[PDB]
Amino acid sequence: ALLVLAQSVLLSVKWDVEDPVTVPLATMSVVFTFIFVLEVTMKIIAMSPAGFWQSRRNRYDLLVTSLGVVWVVLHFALLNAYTYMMGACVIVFRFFSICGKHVTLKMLLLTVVVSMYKSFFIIVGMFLLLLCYAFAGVVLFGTVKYGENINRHANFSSAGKAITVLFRIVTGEDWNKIMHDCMVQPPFCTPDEFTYWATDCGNYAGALMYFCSFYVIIAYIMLNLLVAIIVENFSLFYSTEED
Amino acid sequence: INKPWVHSLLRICAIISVISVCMNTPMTFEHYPPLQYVTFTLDTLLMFLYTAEMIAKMHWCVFDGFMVFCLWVSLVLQVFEIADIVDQMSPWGMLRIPRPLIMIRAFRIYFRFELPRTRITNILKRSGEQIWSVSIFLLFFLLLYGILGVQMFGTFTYHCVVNDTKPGNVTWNSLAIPDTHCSPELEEGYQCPPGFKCMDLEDLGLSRQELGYSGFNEIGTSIFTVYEAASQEGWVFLMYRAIDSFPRWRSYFYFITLIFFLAWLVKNVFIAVIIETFAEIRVQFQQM
Amino acid sequence: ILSMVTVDVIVAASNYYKGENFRRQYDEFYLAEVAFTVLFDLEALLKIWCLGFTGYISSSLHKFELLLVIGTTLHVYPDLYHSQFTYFQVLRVVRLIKISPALEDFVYKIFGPGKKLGSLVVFTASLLIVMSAISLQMFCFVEELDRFTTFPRAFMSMFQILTQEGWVDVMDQTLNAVGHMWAPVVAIYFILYHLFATLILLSLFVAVILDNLELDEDLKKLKQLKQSPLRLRI
Amino acid sequence: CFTVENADAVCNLSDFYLSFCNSYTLWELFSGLMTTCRQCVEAYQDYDHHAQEKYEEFESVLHKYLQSEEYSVKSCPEDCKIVYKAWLCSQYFEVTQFNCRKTIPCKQYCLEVQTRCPFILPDNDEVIYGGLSSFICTGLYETFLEPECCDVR
Amino acid sequence: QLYDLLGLVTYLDWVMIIVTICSCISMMFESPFRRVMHAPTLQIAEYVFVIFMSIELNLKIMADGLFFTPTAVIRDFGGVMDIFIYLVSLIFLCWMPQNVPAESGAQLLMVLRCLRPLRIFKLVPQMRKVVRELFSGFKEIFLVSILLLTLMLVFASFGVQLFAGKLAKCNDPNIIRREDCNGIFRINVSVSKNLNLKLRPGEKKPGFWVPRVWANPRNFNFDNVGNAMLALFEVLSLKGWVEVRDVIIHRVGPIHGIYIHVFVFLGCMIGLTLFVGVVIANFNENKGTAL
């Protein structure tokens, strides 16, 4: 476990061809792999190979080790960016394996993953609501004059932009300034009499209803479902000594 | 000490003492010089009373002894600084840092448990163990996303600067409005338009303090930024800097997953822990 | 009486901004407030004459309404009009809670036994005061830093950190003020305070509210033992 | 059609336009707003110079606005510059103009700026503007609308 | 598990789900400059949707009935929602206007047309279950909302009474009196919040000349009850509340700094926690472990 953690700490600096420091650290990553290979060899030579295979964690370890060996072989031949990114990813995937080693860590990881799995339908419902609001936002505000917080990034000019800004608003950050930007009326804009796509300012009451409804619904109600799910799963799995 | 009236007096004195230490501040006396003598007076008077207590206890108390020692030190420092031999803006005021804790004494009566304290201790032990476990969980995820940020997101110090900007001449007038990050790549990131060019401000000689602490230059600052983002305070602006500076998909995957995992679920684990603590209170005492 | 409360609060909220040209210390809304406070004084005096003073005070609602009567009689003193005492004017709306027994039962359920939430509030206040004084005595002398130049400002800053709004900005400005040798320990203090505030205290509020909505375990066992034409009707 | 160049040569006045604020004519200024005429021409020139300087400042501010071609589907930077120029020039010369062909109230130009010119966020360092635009015309419950100016749009 | 999944719903339901997904994918390409009304490519999905919906409804009506039957196509909110969606779609297809004035009936119809994805809720049984569970505690959510509304009326009335028209400050910090705010001044323009560049001794921050105006802040004011309530609603989210605090303190004097802070305590810390508690309690009740 300690060796795993050290190898994970080897990623403290960005691996980069230009940076000379990258060359030593890459070499430093090689030896660890070999050591890790021994860890596999031991475990596969103490038990029958089938016995080693029986434990899923052993399977994961063997997969990671084989990937690392492939990376080692490539690194000495190509020596390009691809090798360095592959090695960094191998090290990340190995570091993530520490969860199985510890007990409480494993329990909490199981809790989190199970909560994610059991929340699928709720998340789908949130997505469907967000998509409806995205379409309505593109219709109402897709041509709003740029303002305090509508800009290149926060924009309703296409469904993807609308979805991203709505997800932001689910995180809450400055939703009200976007709302007030969408309120913009004359003389701050040039209105159009025939088409809504030829003008550059949005709808007052539409903005109020849209943003207030979306915020109340998503942020005050729906997330508490996921909170409850986390609570339930934590109770289910996490269990220390019991009197 | 015998009369309950003494204990009531000592508790109101504790409240007066915390008020006094809240009042003692250089700009307070700069605004209301007379309070300088008020602060001193209360500071001495209360100390006398507590001295009596220390004298009368010879026939947990270490806390009260430390507190009366701190009152002594504070009174000495106040005598020194009213003499004007030590600058009122000097750091020595830090000697008063532990005096506010006197507030605890005001509630000490409620802190007293006569029932089987063992049960309370067990509850607190369970809660501490759980909190430590979840703390290790959170720290592991923070380190993971730290190293991920260091590898993917480089350093956010390239900016669009006016075409003819020169080193050392960097100034407000050299930046675009609003200040936009950039990438030297021809295909990735934002492309500075005509009359502007992308370059690293840090090379021009700005300090890290002047550039700001946030960023993914090293594991420490990476995990610092990750914790900041996981607080949901300023994450979208960091995402925008990353989108302008690097391939968009990296920023989207990183920040969306960070917000999904850390900012909702992991925080909710502490809510679950505290709910279980209350469930244990229900099981053990059934009377809270 | 409840209708008069409603009309009074509606009139009081209707004192919208018209223009700088005309506004006076005597205006129709002042006379309305005087009339309503007189009416409530009359109501309280009559109720006391009926029930006797001890009988009147015997119930919490009558103590609350007596407090409001006193406050809103002080409120009409022309030097205090629209002072802080205006709170007593608006709190009359709470009388309307008695219009629905369902909402009343929900209130008493969700706020539960007052000891719990009361002690949690007192703990929050004490912790905020202590940490604010601590931060004041660490930072008040630091030049270029206003956020902790006095106790009220320190309290505002620690409360901002509790809300989590711009807390990173308070931190950044503090690390600007202190020298880089000290920035790490200051950052660690701020981080630990934010962590404790956000993960435990708010979780304590959530747990308290959930435990208020939860039934008592003895009531649960009692319930378990006790508990063992459509649209076409036209 | 004779942009005033020399202060002495100038002194029909209805044919001598200013250098920067070409839209106005000396006749107009003489109406509403030998050595005496030299002092007046010199004053006009100095005002023109100041206006030019401030206009250059505005142009330099706007040029760094990278979102110049995206902030509005109905407005372009050129109309912004035009209406800001007309606004500043009117500010310096609060006179009714007589000899143009189509005309509007001068004050309206101020609205035109906030209609056509982008939303520049003011610095919040000594005062919280709370999302208030840098260029605003109407105050709290202030009835905005007087002289007339030429419809240079 | 594959066989069980394939039997989750009827074949007609699966076809309709597929059609809906296709329609929404097509709608995802609609933009203010790539309108379906003028882009034939996008019209195919709409046509297919409408035709298949019509076939579905025609089949189901004469098998169950719209009314006065033991089983009916429309007997709960789901059927009402589906019928409303179908009618909106059909009306849009029949009309399909060429000009959509801003804030008009055409725009309203277009917006209502965006509710199409909701059909998945009814078609997918698990989504229906989720919705029912969520709406079980509607009464408790309503009561919490009434409590928050009462709090907001208290504080709105107080804010209107005390602060009405006092938040207006001259945009020029230098000038202090209303009568002296006339003409033009030089206003600096925000360059970069995060950067901390130090201006040179002989340099001025970028800015330009703007008229002086005695104007209220854009994002909030307390002129009337509505604006006060909107401001307080914004302050419940905990975003931008520090700006409100600073404005109140500087323009209305520092004692009224109490006013906002207590609200934050009562509204945000306690009040919003009521929603979390209620929803978790209702979730546990529905799960069946409450007793």
Ligand SMILES: CC(C)CCC[C@@H](C)[C@H]1CC[C@H]2[C@@H]3CC=C4C[C@@H](OC(=O)CCC(=O)O)CC[C@]4(C)[C@H]3CC[C@]12C
């Ligand atoms: C323990 C509980 C019950 C409350 C304790 C809170 C006290 C510590 C507070 C309450 C009143 C506060 C004082 C209220 C007002 C001021 C004025 C303030 O003066 C100014 O800054 C204004 C300067 C000017 O503009 O003239 C300095 C802080 C001080 C003394 C405050 C210090 C802290 C005090 C004593």
Ligand SMILES: CC(C)CCC[C@@H](C)[C@H]1CC[C@H]2[C@@H]3CC=C4C[C@@H](OC(=O)CCC(=O)O)CC[C@]4(C)[C@H]3CC[C@]12C
């Ligand atoms: C609370 C738990 C979950 C972990 C959070 C991490 C913090 C405990 C520490 C560890 C790394 C620390 C950082 C490590 C490095 C720096 C770099 C330092 O900047 C410099 O090194 C420049 C020195 C100079 O310019 O003189 C400022 C403090 C900071 C951000 C430290 C702030 C506090 C951090 C984030």
Ligand SMILES: CC(C)CCC[C@@H](C)[C@H]1CC[C@H]2[C@@H]3CC=C4C[C@@H](OC(=O)CCC(=O)O)CC[C@]4(C)[C@H]3CC[C@]12C
């Ligand atoms: C069985 C239950 C679910 C009833 C559902 C009925 C819907 C099909 C109704 C309700 C709202 C109606 C709409 C309300 C308002 C308008 C505005 C109207 O706008 C105009 O174009 C007229 C004014 C103009 O053209 O200037 C056109 C009809 C329409 C879309 C209506 C079409 C039919 C709708 C969608």
Ligand SMILES: *[C@@H]1O[C@H](CO)[C@@H](O)[C@H](O)[C@H]1NC(C)=O
């Ligand atoms: C602009 O910045 C300068 C400092 O360079 C300052 O003196 C001036 O007051 C600022 N402008 C405004 C409107 O505050």
